[PDB]
Symmetry: C4
Subunit: 362 residues, 4 copies
């Protein structure tokens, strides 16, 4: 077996150490644009978001209302694929003809039928939805798409957590690669199967490989930090570590625009939020290992998250914090932040010092 020199870590263990802020480092001057799909050195991506936030490929998150609301704010939603091809295509079509950008998730089994339907519906980009994307199944799926559409259809892939996985999907032809296994708020894969890696360590490792790949091939492949975002500053950390954009489930599930019902639990207004690996969703394709067309066991839970209001207001508040921090770090663009960021791990005692302490908060 192979071992590592250091244990993996995640977001709550890090802090950014401010660099020089020039007079032009004003939050209003910060440009949050970011590339969504791979491109050649010196050029621009064919698809650039205005903000680095994308909603998860989940039944309880990316519906028509979410896609429209997020697209309006500059991001993009990936309409969930854990539904019939016909219904998913209809959702994509409704968003495209509500021009707002919209993505759609696909699986490694019915892609020969689902892809044509989604392309026809007007999807701008696709993304294979898999817990563990380091597989020949994803290579086959991407290969078929390239075979039939060449570079006309953009397809994201994976969910790998190290350089090897990234390299495999990059060579396979993925337009962007998703990072993360087990970090999701409603995910229990790490406790059920024992696979995964701290989200931050995964991003840092994959980004290092992505940059080597870029120097070697001249091809820049955007990577997405998927799952584990709890606080707004976690967004800034993920971007600083090298992620081009961030995929979130819980963050968006709390909004009015999520397709779930609002429910009151103990005097608190909540919203339903469940994992694709829960018996409720039954998205067996996401965990498919060539076995029976059913969920062998649960890898996600059914839950409630606090209702946070409208997406627009929340996204605005979150990004204002991101932009402010970027200015503390002397960055006016995401690439600048990724270059200038000074990132340190924090001891548990330092964490205690970071919050309010030795006072009774009024």
């Amino acid at each position: 077996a192979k071992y590592y020199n250091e244990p993996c870590h995640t977001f709550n263990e890090y802090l950014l150490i401010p660099g020089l802020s020039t007079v032009d480092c004003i939050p209003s001057n910060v440009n949050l644009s970011t590339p969504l799909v791979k491109f050649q050195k010196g050029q621009q991506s064919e698809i650039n978001l205005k903000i680095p936030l994308v909603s998860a490929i989940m039944q309880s998150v990316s519906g028509e209302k979410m896609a429209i609301a997020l697209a309006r704010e500059g991001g993009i939603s990936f309409i969930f694929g854990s539904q019939s091809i016909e219904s998913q295509a209809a959702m994509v079509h409704a968003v495209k003809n509500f021009r707002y950008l919209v993505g759609a998730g696909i699986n490694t089994r019915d892609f020969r039928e689902r892809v044509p339907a989604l392309v026809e519906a007007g999807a701008d980009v696709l993304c294979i939805d898999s817990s563990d994307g380091f597989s020949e199944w994803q290579k086959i799926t991407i290969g078929w798409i390239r075979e039939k559409y060449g570079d006309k259809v953009k397809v994201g892939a994976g969910n790998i957590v190290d350089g090897e996985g990234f390299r495999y999907l990059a060579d396979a032809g993925a337009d962007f690669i998703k990072i993360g296994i087990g970090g999701g708020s409603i995910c229990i894969t790490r406790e059920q199967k024992g696979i995964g890696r701290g989200q931050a360590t995964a991003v840092i490792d994959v980004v290092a490989e992505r940059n080597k790949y870029f120097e070697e091939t001249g091809i820049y492949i955007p990577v997405c930090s998927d799952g584990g975002i709890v606080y707004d500053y976690h967004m800034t950390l993920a971007l600083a570590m090298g992620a081009d954009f961030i995929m979130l489930g819980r963050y968006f599930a709390r909004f009015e625009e999520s397709p779930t019902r609002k429910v009151t639990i103990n005097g608190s207004v909540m919203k339903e939020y469940w994992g694709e690996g829960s018996s409720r969703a039954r998205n067996w394709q996401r965990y498919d290992l060539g076995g029976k067309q059913k969920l062998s066991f649960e890898e996600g839970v059914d839950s409630y998250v606090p209702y946070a209001g409208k997406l627009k207001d929340n996204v605005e508040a979150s990004l204002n914090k991101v932009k402010s921090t970027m200015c503390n770090c002397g960055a006016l663009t995401i690439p600048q932040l990724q270059s200038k960021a000074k990132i340190t791990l924090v001891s548990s005692v330092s964490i205690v010092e970071g919050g309010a302490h030795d006072v009774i908060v009024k």
Copy 2:
């Protein structure tokens, strides 16, 4: 004194990082066979289990019903030796003539009488039951067996936690070596005597020495990770780290087939489970240091574990998780897993991220 560069760790601190899964990496294609006794390079062990699980040499675990039920599923039980030679021989005989495989535990004191009786009863393999097997007492016991039976009788030995201990028992002639001191769920040896080592670190260290020994002698000695298995994924980790099979007490004590009584504690159906070092068992031979034929002090406790039902159903569920994970890692056999596994330590904060978080589980 001698010190080490790193502290010891155990199962809960590790995770497997998935490798490439090929289209043939289907759970149904996974072969869980594993060698039980030492063999020569290029050859097969004289005894191979169909599944890598064996039940502990304990009064509250390995009785006749357990031995039959586990043998039926592909594993093997080691009938406890903390009972009269006559009664233990009778249990072995009943299992053999219920052909199901069955093992039997022996001690370093009455082996001249117990061994012949067990061989006569039809035991397929024996195993010295000792907390600390790094001793001349075990070497003497193994030597006597070899003297009287040559290689016809198979005897496991030890419970060592480092390369030195393994080497000693290997040279002594043990057919397989058991790893672990203090990791047992009902064991308090580490708190009473201050001896022991994290189970994972022990397995990793012993396996390293076992592989060097193999290259040096051409003799492959199977090793057993004994104790400390709490979750099903711990089984996968132990195997990935190099263990050929796993010995469990608590895991099996919870089943209908364990020889203990079912008792209701606070509306919950439980089963009795006690350590061999508890006053209830009085297995002083297991902790014998050439002193009086009595337990100097307790090193185990008397307890209750949740009733889990039938062994067959539980073992099936556990191994389905093991096989699934092996497929994520690209392995269809245990040796493949041990070769391909990528194993990382996990920070405490990463552990929190691994479970459900920031949601109210419904």
Copy 3:
């Protein structure tokens, strides 16, 4: 991005290992004098405090009564600047003509008007109040002061946490540099923006750079450990690590002399204490990044701290502990302590051993 070899740590994780105590190492012989502003090698600072304690630039801490009481004991207060120029100047004037030393906080926006008013009022030293002082805004402010007053006006600056930040402000001309981001008892910046560093690590790193700067230029720049002091021994640690003086908010807010109201909360007499970044204070200048003249979001909280009595009695008790420890370390002056101190990190288990344990405290 840039990463570090070790995670940051803070006060609770350290202990001093006693050195040789000579017969002259008596608490009564300890000299707690310390320089407040930069000076040339071989010379003395133009301003030396008798004790290394200064009160925070906060509405809930440094008012007229506090400034007089602390000055009387040998320290100095920095009258808060989060108020009109006229009212702040009046406070400074009242203290100066109550001669007691007194400081005053300024911001990077209205300094052209505030500075003249404060100098006119008789302020002995000024200090830019900023969460993140690594900025051109501070350089511009210091430059203007030097332009108009040369070296006649002393101005402290910053709140940096590493060598780079220190170097920038030193070259900018600051008379003393303040260390610390996010360690304040009422501060939640690290949780809102994700920026900061463990206070101890920050002091140690900045001090190392300060000493290199001294050897290079012959100019000694005093540094201040600002925020995070919870226990009296934390003061000793900060000084031993290299800090010349310590800035405290919570510590002083608990005293009779703080400008806040005493309130009873659950039978306990408390005092109000709030952060400059709370909606109550609205000190937006402290977090200004060239944006709108308002607080974008809260970075501090409103709270209550236990009433501790008169400043004189408390400061006497605190410093008696500091002097005693200095004697255990064989130091009769702060520079001696900084030279002789032996400082070690402490494991969490060692921390448990440090307090009373395994006994019921009567």
Copy 4:
């Protein structure tokens, strides 16, 4: 200031890894004898205990009854010195003429009068009682004793935690050196003054220096691990790390023979136990830094410990565990253990695995 490469650790973080146990490694063959005072290479100490346990120099521990009971079992008590010279001398005299060995604590102030009185009373050995023994005060005290009695009077000294402190007291002429600052169960020095070091790290460091000193001078100076012993296995660890004997307070305070009252607290029979640094004891000499003859502030607490019965029965039970472990490690004497011991640090997760887990203890 000076820093260290690793943080300090203490007893609960360590475990012994068993070595080879020969047939002669029987608990009954273990010799627990140990030297109390320094001697020349190749020779024997003038005072050897039969067991490596000594009672603390405390009012609530070492009275006449304790001294007699412990001496009977092979150890020695150091009659507390925080009382009049006359009364302490009377206690020593009573023990000597009850021949049982007995020690007596002295301080760095009234030694010119206390020492003669104690020698006259028949004390076999003396020991300076100080929290921080790295001082000229101890050197002066030892020097006076040597001046007046030469090598006829044996005097222990210190309480240092590193090689430097040991070296100083060794050169000063101490017959044995005590290790430890802040580890005491009733001690809060580390929380009041911020000085100290993990007990295990202190012992390990001092022992290393002691062994170098021995090679350099041919003089073997016994060292004592003082404070922090919570479990019986902690005794084994301290000895394995190099300590010749162990000083305990809490351990003995629980016995019938301790001079304190038995009190019932919540249906549990307890015994009073307080630190010498508590207002109850007022042992200001122990924390004397040449200041006023009074306790500047408390460094110890007043408490209750569980009543454990008679010393004889408890000491027998404790040492049976020590002897058993020594046999697991292949040692029949303390020097053998110190040579053969294999000591590892243990992760927090490994600690959890070490106790009973995942079972309901009946």
